[PDB]
Design a protein around this ligand. Structure first.
Ligand code: FER
Ligand code: MG
Length: 322
């Protein structure tokens, strides 16, 4: 063992991405380097600091690898915010593929200082509340709701909710404390994060697109990568890129399915409310306003909003059809 790679994230060890991606990734790097690389996993922010501080922990070499949400740093990753727009995503797997290709095309300057192992998204975002069953747009009116990013929080406000921004690792405390009525998140880690018995009302939508997702990165310090010897850099490259994005997305999709099945079957308490095509169209109409406003503001910013939105949408459809 010549080099140690400390990987730091904010999820519990029992989270599916830890059990089914990071542990086998560790196994692969340690086997394929013939023990010359060790990977050490640190869940639950166990090397210190705040979820939003994680990106800089890697970029600045306090740790070697982080897993984080780009939207936790408001304004930092403007081109990545395209993947926060309403009804843009499909599956974790397909949208993660689209995110990685999109980021390799458009986000080279945005990600300078990290080697991206995977640029991906989570599985379909859904609405979770403590008490209020969301059966219509009217039911979310005045609910204190948490989203991952300023653009998802903007959609929540437009839908008539009162968004309160914070990292998801802060939601359990805030719900129990009465700050939040609910949160948007995928189902995949809802059991590992212990939210399932607190937010027991869940709402999902009709049709071939999800309410929202958000862009996530497995990012290694560009200095740690660059400092590896020429025969070990390729062990990382062989366990990096679009195929890793797909793999993370697919693990989330699979964990979502197990979790949704467990609620539908009565094995775990809670209700899944499926909004039909007519009700869903009302949410998509609000969503269209967010898309239009974001493209407009991107133009005054000096970003080509329409071009990034068209390439993101094109890539989602391509990887969904495939
Ligand atoms: C607990 O659900 C999840 C949330 C996120 C995103 C972060 C956020 O919403 O702040 C990613 C994966 C999850 O399993
Ligand atoms: Mg660095």
């Amino acid at each position: 063992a010549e080099y140690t790679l400390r990987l730091h994230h904010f999820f519990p060890a029992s989270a599916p991405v830890h059990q089914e991606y990071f542990l086998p990734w560790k196994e692969a790097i340690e086997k394929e380097s013939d023990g010359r690389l060790a990977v050490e996993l640190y869940p639950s922010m166990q090397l210190g600091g705040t979820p939003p501080s994680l990106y800089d922990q890697a970029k600045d070499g306090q740790v070697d690898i982080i897993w984080t949400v780009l939207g936790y740093n408001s304004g930092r990753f403007p081109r990545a915010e395209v993947f926060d727009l309403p009804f843009l995503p499909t599956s974790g797997a397909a949208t993660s593929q689209a995110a990685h290709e999109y980021a390799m095309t458009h986000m080279q300057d945005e990600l300078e200082g990290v080697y991206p192992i995977a640029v991906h998204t989570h599985s379909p975002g859904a609405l979770h509340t403590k008490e209020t069953r969301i059966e219509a747009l009217e039911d979310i009116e005045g609910l204190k709701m948490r989203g991952p990013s300023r653009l998802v929080n903007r959609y929540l406000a437009k839908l008539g909710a009162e968004p309160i921004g914070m990292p998801v690792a802060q939601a359990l405390e805030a719900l129990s404390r009465g700050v939040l009525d609910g949160t948007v998140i995928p189902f995949e880690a809802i059991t590992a994060m212990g939210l399932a018995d607190i937010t027991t009302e869940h709402t999902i939508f009709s049709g071939d697109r999800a309410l929202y997702t958000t862009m996530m990165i497995v990012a290694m310090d560009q200095d740690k990568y660059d400092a590896l010897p020429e025969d070990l850099q390729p062990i990382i490259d062989a366990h990096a890129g679009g195929r890793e994005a797909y793999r993370i997305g697919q693990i989330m999709d699979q964990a979502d399915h197990r979790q949704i099945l467990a609620i539908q079957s009565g094995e775990q308490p809670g209700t899944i409310t499926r909004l039909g095509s007519e009700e869903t169209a009302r949410w998509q109409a609000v969503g269209q306003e967010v898309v239009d406003e974001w493209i407009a503001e991107a133009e005054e910013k000096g970003l080509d909003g329409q071009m990034l939105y068209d390439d993101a949408t094109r890539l989602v459809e391509r990887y969904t059809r495939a």
